[PDB]
Amino acid sequence: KPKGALAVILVLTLTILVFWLGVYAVFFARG
Amino acid sequence: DEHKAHKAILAYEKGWLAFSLAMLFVFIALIAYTLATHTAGVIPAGKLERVDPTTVRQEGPWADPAQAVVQTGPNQYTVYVLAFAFGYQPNPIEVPQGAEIVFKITSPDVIHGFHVEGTNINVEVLPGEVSTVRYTFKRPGEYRIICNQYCGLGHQNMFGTIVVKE
Amino acid sequence: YEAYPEKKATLYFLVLGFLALIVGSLFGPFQALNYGNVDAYPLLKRLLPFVQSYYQGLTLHGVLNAIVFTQLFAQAIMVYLPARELNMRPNMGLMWLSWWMAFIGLVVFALPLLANEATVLYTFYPPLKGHWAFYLGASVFVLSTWVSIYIVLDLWRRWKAANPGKVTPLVTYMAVVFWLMWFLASLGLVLEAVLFLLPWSFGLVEGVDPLVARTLFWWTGHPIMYFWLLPAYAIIYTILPKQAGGKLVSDPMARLAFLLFLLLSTPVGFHHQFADPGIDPTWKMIHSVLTLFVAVPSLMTAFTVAASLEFAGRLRGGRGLFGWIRALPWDNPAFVAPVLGLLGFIPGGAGGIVNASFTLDYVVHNTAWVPGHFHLQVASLVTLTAMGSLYWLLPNLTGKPISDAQRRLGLAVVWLWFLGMMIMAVGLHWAGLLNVPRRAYIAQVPDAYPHAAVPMVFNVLAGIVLLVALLLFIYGLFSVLLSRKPELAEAPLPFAEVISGPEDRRLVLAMDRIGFWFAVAAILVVLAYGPTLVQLFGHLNPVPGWRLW
Ligand code: HAS
Numbered sequence A: 001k002p003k004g005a006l007a008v009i010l011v012l013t014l015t016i017l018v019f020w021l022g023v024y025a026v027f028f029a030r031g
Numbered sequence B: 001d002e003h004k005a006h007k008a009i010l011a012y013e014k015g016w017l018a019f020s021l022a023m024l025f026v027f028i029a030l031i032a033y034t035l036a037t038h039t040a041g042v043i044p045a046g047k048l049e050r051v052d053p054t055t056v057r058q059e060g061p062w063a064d065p066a067q068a069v070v071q072t073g074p075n076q077y078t079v080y081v082l083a084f085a086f087g088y089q090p091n092p093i094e095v096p097q098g099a100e101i102v103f104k105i106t107s108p109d110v111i112h113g114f115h116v117e118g119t120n121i122n123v124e125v126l127p128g129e130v131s132t133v134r135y136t137f138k139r140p141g142e143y144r145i146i147c148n149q150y151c152g153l154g155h156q157n158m159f160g161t162i163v164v165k166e
Numbered sequence C: 001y002e003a004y005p006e007k008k009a010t011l012y013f014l015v016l017g018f019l020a021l022i023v024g025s026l027f028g029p030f031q032a033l034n035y036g037n038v039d040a041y042p043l044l045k046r047l048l049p050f051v052q053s054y055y056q057g058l059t060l061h062g063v064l065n066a067i068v069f070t071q072l073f074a075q076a077i078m079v080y081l082p083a084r085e086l087n088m089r090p091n092m093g094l095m096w097l098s099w100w101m102a103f104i105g106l107v108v109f110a111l112p113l114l115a116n117e118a119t120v121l122y123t124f125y126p127p128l129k130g131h132w133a134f135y136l137g138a139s140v141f142v143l144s145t146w147v148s149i150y151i152v153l154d155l156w157r158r159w160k161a162a163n164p165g166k167v168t169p170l171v172t173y174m175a176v177v178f179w180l181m182w183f184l185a186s187l188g189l190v191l192e193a194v195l196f197l198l199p200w201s202f203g204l205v206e207g208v209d210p211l212v213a214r215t216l217f218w219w220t221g222h223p224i225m226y227f228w229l230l231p232a233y234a235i236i237y238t239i240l241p242k243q244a245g246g247k248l249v250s251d252p253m254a255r256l257a258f259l260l261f262l263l264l265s266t267p268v269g270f271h272h273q274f275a276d277p278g279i280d281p282t283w284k285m286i287h288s289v290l291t292l293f294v295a296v297p298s299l300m301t302a303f304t305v306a307a308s309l310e311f312a313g314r315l316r317g318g319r320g321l322f323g324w325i326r327a328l329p330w331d332n333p334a335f336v337a338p339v340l341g342l343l344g345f346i347p348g349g350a351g352g353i354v355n356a357s358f359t360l361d362y363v364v365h366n367t368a369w370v371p372g373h374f375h376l377q378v379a380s381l382v383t384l385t386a387m388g389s390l391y392w393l394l395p396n397l398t399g400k401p402i403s404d405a406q407r408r409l410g411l412a413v414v415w416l417w418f419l420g421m422m423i424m425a426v427g428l429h430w431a432g433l434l435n436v437p438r439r440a441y442i443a444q445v446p447d448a449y450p451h452a453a454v455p456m457v458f459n460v461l462a463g464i465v466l467l468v469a470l471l472l473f474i475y476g477l478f479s480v481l482l483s484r485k486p487e488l489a490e491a492p493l494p495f496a497e498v499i500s501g502p503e504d505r506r507l508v509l510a511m512d513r514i515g516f517w518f519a520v521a522a523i524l525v526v527l528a529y530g531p532t533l534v535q536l537f538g539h540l541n542p543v544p545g546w547r548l549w
């Protein structure tokens, strides 16, 4: 199995999620 | 080894492509949600509504900024905003808190932004068209308008004021 | 060189590209300090006296960095690479035609740019009215790609003619879908330029409809950014694997990515028009959904590319969960640039994804968030990729060799560049979250955004870091250019091998049905843009131009 690749996409997902959920919080705060 | 590695890489890329797909969908579902809620007031009415940028300051709801605020419901007001070079009329905009505010904003020269600081109201203003957004101010006080679209040299200093009345 | 005359044409497309990057970039560290609330424009005006405004610099910067350099590079890569893979010669007549069209269009557009005559920024939205030389010069420049489109479709068919019943070779499949995708994408701006922009600027018509022009623009607008990204992807896909010490893990996976970029690059452009009036929300919701889709191929790329590297690193003795990372050829800048670029691409697309979600766009639209986001995209991943090509393309093209020291200087530029772009990306995202508008000379209204004092320091720092990186790249570029050793010119391009697993012959063949996909892609454009455009042309309402500078 490709642990490194999986690792990288793990960082990718978390980033996307922190980014997305973050702005969505801010959207609802300004709403 | 190469035979084995290829088998696993592809096997796992697929899982990821499904997971990423799912996450993308869940986002879509969460965008749809907001579409169903009062916070979607800020999306511009996609209705075309042409006006004439040359005469707008002489005739119409933009010619007299002292009359730009008009009650349209028991708890809803329409405000007629001219974003221009370089500022906004009226100054300030005054509305009561808790009322639904239908912003009808147009330009007489170039394109400006109408971004109400501390809010979701962020809408391009194009000369020749009325841009319509809806917001209900929750906290009373003084909010700032910033022009966030390049409108010539006077851009950095182009601001306005909305004053929400307790 | 008298046998590979494609080398000289490719060379010119690169150098002019890099020239444009340098001139455009000079303005960057100045915009950086600006967003750090520090005013260094005085200094620059002494240094470059034609510069009349912060905004004149911002026009040059975007036009020269984002339009000129990126495309030249696209042209330099996506003609030559397929030409070498197929071991076949381009239509040299055409190949030169395209270069002259680009060089001539650029010189013409540069004249009013440098003359403070078309200070409208690279998006050039009406009713701000620039000098006709800008739009014509712009048009002729962009049309140069149509000649590249031809050349490569030419090469393609000739190969197929000589090799029927064979699947299109990888690089060539990527290149062909690339161009075909660009053609569709290019129609929007052509239309805008021809139907609207040119006549107006020439004075044939009195005004232009700002909404229709924004709509036609953002047709081309978005997929142009994939046209920018793809040549870098081509390199990351069909070369980086070898420079990293391994192979590309999947031929078909790479093709799928690219096929997806043909189908999904153009029909998504309201995402730039989320704050525009007169465009139905339902269509915005559509375009947002479709935009989200076009993220897939990059998401797919993320994995294909990462896995390729893990494999590369394991072959070099990497053991562990991290071992392979340290095992990679980090002393080699041709390898480093793109990898670093892909790294910053994580947070990059992460912001892209947010931007794409409709209502969330109102949180960040037209604020410093945006620039902060996209510098990871174009000003980093693409720019870096093109930078590390100095170390493998340039020697390939000119015989001239990369000294040991020059290599080390390369690592420096690349690294400091990547770091500057990170640092600036923090400051700008953060600042956009504080409502600081993009496209503003904010350092001239220094008491306007006090809450943004923290991120501003990152901006400033990024400014000086990136000034040092740029300076270093200038020195270095000219140290390579103004240096011929024999085997360095004739030795092959580091095209990677592909890992051995039965591929999907069934899919690779399907994907090879290019005529079909091209039509599909086009139908999508008609379906996604068609209705809105019909309604918009039905109710055109032109308005007077303005010159507010
Ligand atoms: C190079 C050029 C660009 C690309 C590509 C690009 C991609 C996208 N963009 Fe964008 N774009 C938007 C959405 C996206 C999305 C969904 C994507 C997608 O393609 C994103 C997909 C990417 C990913 C999901 C990341 C995958 C990660 C990878 C591939 C890296 C993996 C790392 C590895 C493998 C490294 C491993 C290494 C080790 C050794 C560990 C939206 C809205 O929906 C806005 C409008 C904002 C507004 O309101 O104005 C926008 C604005 C812009 C602007 C401003 C235009 C202007 O001036 O007004 C620019 C110039 C631009 C450029 C670019 N951006 N974009």
Ligand code: HEM
Pocket (backbone or CB within 6 Å): C025, C027, C028, C029, C030, C031, C032, C035, C058, C059, C061, C062, C065, C066, C069, C070, C121, C122, C123, C371, C375, C378, C379, C380, C383, C437, C438, C439, C440, C441, C462, C463, C466, C467, C470
């Ligand atoms: C020394 C590196 C550079 C620095 C410090 C830098 C800095 C800047 C800054 C701070 C801005 C925002 C200015 C504003 O919104 O008012 C900007 C925008 C811009 N930059 Fe750069 N950048 C540089 C290199 C590049 C390069 C390599 C490109 C892409 C090839 C580029 C692409 C863009 C584009 C497209 C704009 C938007 C222009 C507009 O809004 O009209 N940057 N850059």
Ligand SMILES: CCCCCCCC/C=C\CCCCCCCC(=O)OC[C@H](O)CO
Pocket (backbone or CB within 6 Å): C325, C326, C327, C330, C343, C419, C422, C423, C426
């Ligand atoms: C605010 C943020 C500003 C700070 C910027 C932080 C962003 C990430 C920086 C670098 C990523 C590099 C990660 C991979 C490490 C590469 C070095 C390496 O592995 O080198 C091996 C060594 O040479 C043995 O041979």
Ligand code: CUA
Pocket (backbone or CB within 6 Å): B084, B085, B086, B111, B112, B113, B147, B148, B149, B150, B151, B152, B155, B156, B158
């Ligand atoms: Cu009005 Cu910028």
Ligand SMILES: [O-][O-]
Pocket (backbone or CB within 6 Å): C221, C222, C225
């Ligand atoms: O434009 O992404």
Ligand SMILES: [Cu+2]
Pocket (backbone or CB within 6 Å): C221, C222, C223, C225, C269, C271, C272
């Ligand atoms: Cu886009």
